[PDB]
Amino acid sequence: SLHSIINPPIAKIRNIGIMAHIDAGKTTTTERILYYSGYTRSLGDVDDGDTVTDFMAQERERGITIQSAAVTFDWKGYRVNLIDTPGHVDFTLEVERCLRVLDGAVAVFDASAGVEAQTLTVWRQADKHNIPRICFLNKMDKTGASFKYAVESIREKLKAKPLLLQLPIGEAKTFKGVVDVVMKEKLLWNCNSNDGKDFERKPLLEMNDPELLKETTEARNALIEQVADLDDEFADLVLEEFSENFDLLPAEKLQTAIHRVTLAQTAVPVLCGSALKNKGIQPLLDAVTMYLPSPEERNYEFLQWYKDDLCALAFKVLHDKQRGPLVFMRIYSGTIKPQLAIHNINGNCTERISRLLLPFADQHVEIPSLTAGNIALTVGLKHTATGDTIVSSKSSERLLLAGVEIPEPVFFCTIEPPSLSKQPDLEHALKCLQREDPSLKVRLDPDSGQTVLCGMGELHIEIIHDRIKREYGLETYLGPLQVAYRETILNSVRATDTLDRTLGDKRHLVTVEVEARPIETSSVMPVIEFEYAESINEGLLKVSQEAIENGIHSACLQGPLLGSPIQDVAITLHSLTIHPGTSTTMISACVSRCVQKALKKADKQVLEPLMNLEVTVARDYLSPVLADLAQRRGNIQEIQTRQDNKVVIGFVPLAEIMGYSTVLRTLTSGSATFALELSTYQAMNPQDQNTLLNRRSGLT
Amino acid sequence: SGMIRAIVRAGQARPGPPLGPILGQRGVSINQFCKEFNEKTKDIKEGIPLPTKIFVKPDRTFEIKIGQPTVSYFLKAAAGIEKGARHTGKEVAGLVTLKHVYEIARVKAQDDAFALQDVPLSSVVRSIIGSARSLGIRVVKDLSSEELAAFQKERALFLAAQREADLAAQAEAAKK
Amino acid sequence: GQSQTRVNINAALVEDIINLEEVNEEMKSVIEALKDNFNKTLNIRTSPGSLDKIAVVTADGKLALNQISQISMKSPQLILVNMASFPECTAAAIKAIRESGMNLNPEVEGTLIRVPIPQVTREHREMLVKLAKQNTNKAKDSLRKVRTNSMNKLKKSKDTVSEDTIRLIEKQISQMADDTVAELDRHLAVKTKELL
Amino acid sequence: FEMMRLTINRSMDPKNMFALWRVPAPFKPITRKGMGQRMGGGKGAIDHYV
Ligand SMILES: Nc1nc2c(ncn2[C@@H]2O[C@H](COP(=O)(O)OP(=O)(O)NP(=O)(O)O)[C@@H](O)[C@H]2O)c(=O)[nH]1
Ligand SMILES: [Mg+2]
Ligand SMILES: [Mg+2]
């Protein structure tokens, strides 16, 4: 309907992003907004439906938003770019990229929800990015909804003073309207689709409902008190002109004060509503256009330094087959043009802009011209990095913009191609996925070099696997990471062996007396090291010596308990009686057999890899975290009571951190972090060694 | 709001753990507490430990009450030893005279416990004697002319032998 | 139904015409050999000691690659075999490696035999399960031979010993063989679960 | 005998208690048939001591 839209100036353009908890209504709210703007013609649902937003097959089948959707639309004299963020704990990279690219946030809460710790963590991210936010209390039609309880929870456990701007009529399936505070009006909705195509304005029922009047005027007085206590200039105005009036003015200076407290990072305007019942979306859009920042309302140091150049920030990438390498960016300074050479700051190289357009997330429109403060999609940028600056003419120690930091992925899996012939396809798909999502690290394991995936969570790994299966066509298999054990001997043991092989010509005889003992310089030589001591015999060992080294190395590569490498032993050759004409290969075979027998009859011991676990949690969750660490055999090294946090530093084996991120998040309700780094190899006590051996052998 | 006890140094009142986080959780500022402690104990020798009581009131107001140092520190300073004995009774770390015990009792009588419990100095002397017994410090009636140094030399050689034995045991355990 | 009454007669009222302790030791040796093969060869990934047991025809005999060559690691995913001592048996070594079930495809370079590590994949795991089944079958054949030797000893003693005594000892040996083959099957199942 | 020994040793304080046996070690042999379950054929074979 209204697909053709006109670009506007800075004061009439806004860019914002929607954040909330999982299943809080971001996609539904965006769909309702598009339906009211006219771009969307038919009203659908996420269950059945799933219109322009969440266009992927995985997002349609799982009922969740995986990747952020960028949309552009027009309100009454306002052109606004919206970003529907995923809102999961495993897509915090996407959330942070969409917060960093542009300012302005809409934090959606559920009335009968509480804190919804994902909302808390996205709130912390937005606070770190220093962007204004507006609170939208959705799901007002759901049973058990409580606007007052939600506001109290926001005040208490979010640590931010809210500014109530709307009062709902009902809570439990009787929320049929809202009452505005700044305008002193009531908005009603009586229909199924679009709820009358508009909102019905009958201000406070024309001086007829005393209870509604008293509640509305008390709410207005409270809002005026809050804004006056927050802002100083508005406090001065209230002091000077409208003190005893308590009715300052309808919508000019009160709205100015609320805009100032929105932009001053000291207040969030709270508006109730319900997207599914098509209620409050138009008031939400009005408040978005009246309060949320324009691109230049915040004094950008980058723009202040340079505005005549073409500084822009490429923040997202896409690898669609037909389009090619697509780049989502934000234009900061100047007006950008297609088919013009552009320069990168990180890659100090020139790129040709094949074409440029505006994202509506389902089709290409090929917008010819775009100005500053706009989200744009560019085609043909093959050489692109996740965080980089793009300029023109190279005006200027470098014009580099701090982009997106890798969130240090914590969950580990191993990917399995179905065949060696299909392995190149898997590697190409993994490279494409790595260049798309920088939080999905792929590494090669040092020992038993399988290809491993490092992601943010089990859901992230599962959806990456599904995307690989669907988009590239590979039936791959996931598996737990393998633990590289080591082996050692506990007591010195002797061994003898004799080798004869009469093949005809070249008769030979080897007789080896050797003994293997534990070494003492394990800390001196933490790497896999061996001591090689030959006794005083035979007077000359060069080829025999080389055969000795080769054979004993081959014997040590394989262990007699778990097939694991052996380390930290001393092998001493007591006798090496050879016959004239022996081959060095047969000598090495004899010595390998003798050493294998010695290590077999040696009271062997197995060693596990040990690393540093650094866990950051709260205080009410420290006890379960410590209990789980002790269950998984973590020796606590230190505990530090940080400011409103607790950091535990301990030593935990590799074999006992299988899927630790999921368990930690379950125990801490998602509010916990941990870091790992391998330090040394420790020796198991006999109890754990026997337990591991029994597990590996089955039940016996 | 609650009762808080803390072993704090005379002037080394750092705003860090394990004292800063507790007061921050309570609600009062830690910088003000450190400044008040330093200004109140600026005339006390820095380095010695002392117990103190912190009272926190609603509106986040704090007050400080400071008592006499620990009897452990008093007796260790009197005996001239840096650390106590491990095997109490079987080995002796130092010697403290009943005269030193009486001096310690007199200087510590002006604490909250023995002030609220108005008792003669005999009870305090007996308590100091029991504390010395726990410390492993023998309490001879009147013997300090040079035998104190004579015992100090043999105590030093015994401590060196114990350190050597501990190092040998640690090495044997590491190699085991 | 219980259906199988275990018998442990004494081994000590006999002590002379058969050694039940010796038979049990031989069966335990068979089990230990199977476990050692499983640990050394089929861990997850081939190692220079894993292909040291592939028999190669030489002078109308069977010799191992470790015996007739020098096996080492050049690259992290490569195995280098130097047949300097026996350059004649190069083609036989290639045949042994290629029709070995361990999925090693070697490249002939005159004498420097080059074996890459193929991968750890579903196909590789399936071939490893096949090798585990083959080795379990070979261990079962070895156990059958061990049991046949004890039966032959009983046949040798079957001229003056009571028929009931011989039958009881035969039942005991059969029971031990059944227990050991059940243990072999359990180990094979555990290894298959580990691989897959 | 092993049950008594283990229980008393683990539940008794060596520093303040002492314990002694008053029955001799198992010396009387007990025989079980073993080879052949039919009645007759002679005495059984020594199995354990009581
Ligand atoms: N009762 C009720 N249900 C609602 C409301 N808004 C959304 N829902 C329901 O909440 C569920 C999630 O909807 P959706 O818009 O996808 O939420 P989301 O925040 O985008 N989820 P995600 O974070 O995974 O992307 C759906 O079943 C939808 O019907 C509302 O106002 N009332
Ligand atoms: Mg839910
Ligand atoms: Mg769901």
Ligand SMILES: [Mg+2]
């Ligand atoms: Mg969604």
